[PDB]
Amino acid sequence: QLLHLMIHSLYSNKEIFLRELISNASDAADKLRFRALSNPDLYEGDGELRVRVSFDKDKRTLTISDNGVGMTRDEVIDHLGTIAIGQFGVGFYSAFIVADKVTVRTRAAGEKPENGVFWESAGEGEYTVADITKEDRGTEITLHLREGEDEFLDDWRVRSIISKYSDHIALPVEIEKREEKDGETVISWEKINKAQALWTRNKSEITDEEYKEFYKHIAHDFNDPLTWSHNRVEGKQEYTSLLYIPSQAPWDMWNRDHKHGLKLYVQRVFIMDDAEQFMPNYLRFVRGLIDSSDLPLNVSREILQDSTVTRNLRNALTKRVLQMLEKLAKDDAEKYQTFWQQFGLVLKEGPAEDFANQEAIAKLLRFASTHTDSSAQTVSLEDYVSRMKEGQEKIYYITADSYAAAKSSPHLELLRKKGIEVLLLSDRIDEWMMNYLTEFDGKPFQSVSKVDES
Amino acid sequence: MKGQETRGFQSEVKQLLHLMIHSLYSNKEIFLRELISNASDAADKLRFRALSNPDLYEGDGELRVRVSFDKDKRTLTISDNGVGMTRDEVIDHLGTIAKSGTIGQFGVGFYSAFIVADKVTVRTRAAGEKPENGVFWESAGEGEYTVADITKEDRGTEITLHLREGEDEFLDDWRVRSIISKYSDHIALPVEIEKREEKDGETVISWEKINKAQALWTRNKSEITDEEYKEFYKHIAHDFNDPLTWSHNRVEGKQEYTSLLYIPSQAPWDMWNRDHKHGLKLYVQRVFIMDDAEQFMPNYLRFVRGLIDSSDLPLNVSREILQDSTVTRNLRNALTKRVLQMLEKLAKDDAEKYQTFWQQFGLVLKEGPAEDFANQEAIAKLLRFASTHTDSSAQTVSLEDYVSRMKEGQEKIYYITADSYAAAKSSPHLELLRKKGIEVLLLSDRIDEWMMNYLTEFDGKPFQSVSKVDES
């Protein structure tokens, strides 16, 4: 039970806990830097945010300490007391793959050090909570390594790993550096981290693993993105965007209770997650961030809804997704087919929602067809067009509930006989979509079906 | 259906779950991969018990797995004709699962399944049993299951998922046909999908193979995709991680066999265990013999996963035999060399992936210079160290690299031994050397010490250290 299912689902990469606590640190710092803008005292001492990693080979413990927003006993109770922010939970329990005891100690931002929180668990089922006095604010996680997990006690190996999960993080990730220097012990801290907000760096110098690690960072997805697009704009609109396209559709995609939007930053200051006013509905699947100069620091989820600057930004961002997608479509056909398998049904509600970009959208669509006796929705409108017979004016299509149903079940033999190709639309939404996508490249569509004799 | 009896209760639940569902939403299409891999295995086991009793095939000797669905009923079936299940194997394996709702992989599959289906039904009959001993099984995957004895002429297992709503992609021909094609390109057992067709009033059913159906290692290197390889690894190693590289080789002549050997991206949680799980997968004349056959690799390479098809071994061969078998010894030696060539290559083609390998297995590989003198030289090149040459603790120093950087007139390879990279770096009395400017390997692994008592020289050059044992 405990063993198997995970030894294969999560234990795959037992380093997972590490690329989470660090991610949590990179977010706790963000929140703090946002509160402290208008409330300097929160920094109460050190304003140089960083996450520190260190180990005690003798005591067998790895520690990760950050000085960000820290937590409240309620915030803690909430994440670790699940059943009789989110990543912290995953990272915590995920740590047990490599640890038999994980201990947390945190004191909140702007709080009496006497209001610190202490939470511990030896894995199993019994935890330990306690109010305590924590001097420096932030969160500190101490792991007690199991036998055989001594790789997290080797300066080299540990350093190396940490790198793999922070080159994309802006928060400095410092590693302890003791050096036996005359008599006493000189304790230093050097940073492994390049420490610059990813979207801030020049595309030229960002590795693919960095873009990929960064996607998993903001989207909270174990999978890699299919493509992305990094763009910096100046002038009319001044902002920086970095948008992704997953490779697997999230479970909450087909729900009224979403998970969509872009991560919003203003003047490099974090504002909120899931700013849904930035992408139209037919692009719910896009993930990414936007860092605007033209938006106030005090923007409201409410403001963006009636915000013109936002609509303008949304329109611009919309076209980038469409370009990204077409570039993918020409650059790597195999991944686009993946895209289409995961999101084709979401993209089909675009012709009725976005007609300024209708042509573009239509080019990204794929269809099943008579041109191959398979149901592979591999056919593109342009392809269809290129194969039309001389004298053919219309793009023919049939609608049904099944590929099968629409294939040899209708009355398309006249067309078959004339050697004309017929799109075989068979998705629940196709019928509705065809009310808005009425012509492509100057050639109008037309269905086959019953009842019609002028 | 006689004797329908419902069985309910057990008592366990927490942490684990939420953690898994998190990863079982990462890919709901996975349950399909499991069932297909399962039928693939429930097929090799039938072929093993085969020759010892050719009557188990009861007619159909063409093993396969059929996938089909019914949109109106919202069902998806994955029936194979492999070995099957005994009422007890059923209750034993399928019971535990149903009890913790809300061998081995036989669970991931059904678990992910329930995420997708609000009901899974399993009609089965183990090979070599009267059609009357057919076992039925079902469960809303809530807390209780139902069992009954049914009659199933057809041997094998017939799993059926009733799809939850919103899970319509699994009733979609195109859609379903891909995933299958995705999780079977690397499988030998044929994977067929139903091809229904109404012929003038009637409805004729046929089955078309979507699968290539060739044993991966039986195909030419050229023809195999880098992806088919990676997926084949996961299938036999049970490791969701891609491997770093591999080595496919078909040897003809004096030694008739084929070998596919991989080098995992990460050390499992049992590398340093006396309850291992280490060994290759043995095949004889293409027929599956056994798993984790540790008699084929030297202990210092226990990290290697892969398989082997011997043409010089009897369809008998047992662990006990391989152990005392000459043919085997010559193979372990042959494979050992191939692993080192592979490793040696990796170091050349991708200094970065090799640095991963080092990181993951460097310490296991350090036992080799003293447990295999015959190859001590090759092994010595593969090792990597943290020298003074760069102000870093990174273990990126080749011993060959070292032979280079050696002020003329120098003939010894110098090294320090410490408990930490820290100690080793300056804690000693290095100065004298630092002055004359000489490269010094900084060793900080517990095993290093043991190793330096046997690793005497490398490139004709002997090793000399800068010792210091200061304890009152």
Swiss-Prot record, chain A:
Membrane topology label: Peripheral membrane protein
Positions of ATP binding: 24, 66, 92, 139, 220
GO molecular function, one term: unfolded protein binding
Primary localization: cytoplasm
CC per GO annotation: cytosol; plasma membrane
Compartments, as annotated in UniProt: Cytoplasm; Cell inner membrane
Region (B): 302-454
Region named A: 1-301
Region forming the signal peptide: none
Key words of the record: ATP-binding, Cell inner membrane, Cell membrane, Chaperone, Cytoplasm, Membrane, Nucleotide-binding, Phosphoprotein, Stress response
GO biological process terms on file: DNA damage response; FtsZ-dependent cytokinesis; protein folding; response to heat
Post-translational modification, as annotated: Phosphorylated.
Membrane-spanning intervals of the chain: none
Domain of life, source organism: Bacteria
UniProt function note: Molecular chaperone. Has ATPase activity.
Subunit and partners: Homodimer. Oligomerizes at 65 degrees Celsius.
Similarity remark: Belongs to the heat shock protein 90 family.
Protein name, entry field: Chaperone protein HtpG
Organism: Escherichia coli (strain K12)
Full-length numbering of the shown residues: 15 to 489 of 624
Curated annotation (Swiss-Prot), chain B:
Region of the whole protein represented: 1 to 489 of 624
Localization per Swiss-Prot or TrEMBL: Cytoplasm; Cell inner membrane
GO cellular component: cytosol; plasma membrane
Tagged with keyword Membrane: yes
Quaternary data: Homodimer. Oligomerizes at 65 degrees Celsius.
Protein's name in the database: Chaperone protein HtpG
Residues covered by region (B): 320-472
Any one biological process term the GO annotation gives: response to heat
Function: Molecular chaperone. Has ATPase activity.
Start and end residues of each stretch annotated as A: 1-319
Membrane topology per record: Peripheral membrane protein
Binding site for ATP: 38, 80, 110, 157, 238
Family per similarity comment: Belongs to the heat shock protein 90 family.
UniProt PTM: Phosphorylated.
UniProt GO MF annotations: ATP binding; ATP hydrolysis activity; ATP-dependent protein folding chaperone; identical protein binding; protein folding chaperone; protein homodimerization activity; protein-folding chaperone binding; unfolded protein binding
Keywords for this protein: ATP-binding, Cell inner membrane, Cell membrane, Chaperone, Cytoplasm, Membrane, Nucleotide-binding, Phosphoprotein, Stress response
Main location: cytoplasm
